[model samples]
Target: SMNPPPPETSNPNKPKRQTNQLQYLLRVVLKTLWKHQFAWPFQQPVDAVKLNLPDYYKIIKTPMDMGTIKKRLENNYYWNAQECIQDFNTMFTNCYIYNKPGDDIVLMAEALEKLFLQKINELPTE
Candidate 1:
């Protein structure tokens, strides 16, 4: 008599994998922040006045002049790291909501982490 395909084994570590999803989410946020050059040794509430933000800001298409855009960029929440992180978190949530495959997420996460780590390693150690 043929056996029932060894009862169709499942990964013993499968449960542990899902358990780290939340942790991974946090790490992604942190790594993304680093990738965007938010500076190391971040503080809680992350002082915006101290951040060296990018000059070019993403804005909606409107009949605004460069001077107006520059002024808005300085005061706008869109350029804030904290706000970007919130948006990134929402993007991650939508990935799950739309049933994004884990493989792509994991690959993207690894790439981001690697890029950030490489940048960190390049810094002169004290």
Candidate 2:
């Protein structure tokens, strides 16, 4: 049997479209946190070490191009893969003090990727 008519209907199980927007914002926030805390250090080891002084505004004030970072945050893409690799090579040559297998470096990179996907999954999506 079918009902005659209904004024309005909504599915409680389904999320609204705005959910995706909220998710996008959450992802941006997470990416920003990761970029400031870990990614920057992993990317720019020289700057991270040399600026290890009190009230060293020069290092803090250094400008990081956010265009590529924004793309990564939005699309989960690392457009600067080559740059990161170069920076990492420098890190291995000059930054890392311990002479161990390169597996540690590989693990760190994999960890970052895992965190990215985990954050994406945590976002509120429709």
Candidate 3:
């Protein structure tokens, strides 16, 4: 039979370690995304009256925003990074669906997405 590694190698409270790391990650990388200028459009729920898109809600089945994500992050609601980033992805996807192919808003979303991709790549998974 193959031998197993010692118990010490497993380390204690590995889950807690992940919690702390996730907290730090949200505060840092995601913070930058929130503060970026392009993020302003996604900062809050778009007002239909202000934008004159009365059917906005009908198009986007699930609306996500930077502020909402920030609030969730403050509440320590996300258990994993993918779940956290998925909100951002959803926001961008909604924007893509609601805008024209070469619209300015779509361009902004693409730029912000690339920036987000770069930031996630910087994460230390190893």
TM-score of each: 0.24, 0.31, 0.78
Q: How well does candidate 1 score on lDDT at residue 30?
A: 42
Clashing residue pairs in candidate 2 are none
Encode model 2's per-residue lDDT on 1-126: one tens digit a residue. 222222112334533333343445435634454564445544422332355443323322322322333433344232233332232233333323322346565455445546655654565534
lDDT of each: 0.33, 0.39, 0.72
Pitting candidate 2 against candidate 3, the one with the higher lDDT is: 3
Which ranges of candidate 1 are over 4 A from the true structure?
Answer: 1-75, 100-126
- Residue 91's lDDT within candidate 1 is 32
Q: Report, for all candidates in order, the number of backbone clashes.
A: 0, 0, 0
Candidate 2 stretches greater than 4 Å from native: 1-36, 41-67, 71-102
* Model number with the top TM-score: 3
Order of models, best TM-score first: 3, 2, 1
- Please say which candidate is ahead in lDDT: 1 or 3: 3
| Residue-level lDDT tens digits of model 1 in 57-111 | 2111111222222222233323233333344343333334433456664445345
Model 3 bad stretches (over 4 Å) = 1-21
Clashing pairs in 1: none
